[PDB]
Design a protein around this ligand. Structure first.
Ligand code: EAE
Ligand code: EAE
Lengths: 113, 113
């Protein structure tokens, strides 16, 4: 493994702990969610993100954050605000962007000098 | 855990993997290596470094590199050049400092932007 892969695997684990029931663990498809494909054109989930880490397809924390943000946007677009799915997506998005702050990324970034 | 701890744990696993027999895994004792305490002023080993990581006592990769270099210098000071201990110490010292090179950490630096 490489250092960036280890950093992204750490972030991903923290985020998955905030989704204990695995709402975001696998790709949502039309077989479970009517009309999903035509509402959610850019699907994303934790499992695809793990595969992209393993495949070393992320070159930055910015790219990783964008996939995480996409996933939570999709969940808030498709599900109505009354659903546990929409409600959890809003909460992990807030927490996730607070754990990968500009600030926190600069503090961790002064540790490597 | 914290991001810096996870990064140092990664480096430590890479280094410990080059010492499958655990020459460096635990403190050398005078019962095993006569006069060690009298010759080696500042003992160091992988287990203590892991203890300091968990205890979040490293504030830089530089500080971490300093304990690693200490560990390998100690082994080459106490053990004669024909011994497995001296030879492995020299080999992991070079490998570890190529893995925590200035360049490699500055590239990793841009990845967290
Ligand atoms: C994977 C769970 N989950 C959703 C997740 C997100 C993030 O949108 S959307 C949803 C709709 C139906 C279903 O099967 C009853 C499950 C379901
Ligand atoms: C624990 C291995 N090892 C050394 C370790 C370091 C890092 O120096 S020094 C030493 C001397 C004798 C011995 O038993 C033959 C072992 C011994």
């Amino acid at each position: 493994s490489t250092p960036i892969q280890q950093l992204l695997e750490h972030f991903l684990r923290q985020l998955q702990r905030k989704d204990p029931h695995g709402f975001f663990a696998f790709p949502v498809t039309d077989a479970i969610a009517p009309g999903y494909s035509m509402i959610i054109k850019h699907p994303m989930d934790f499992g695809t993100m793990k595969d992209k880490i393993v495949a070393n397809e992320y070159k930055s924390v910015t790219e990783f954050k964008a996939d995480f943000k996409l996933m939570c946007d999709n969940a808030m677009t498709y599900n109505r605000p009354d659903t546990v799915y929409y409600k959890l997506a809003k909460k992990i998005l807030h927490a996730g962007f607070k754990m990968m702050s500009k600030e926190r990324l600069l503090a961790l970034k002064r540790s490597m000098s």
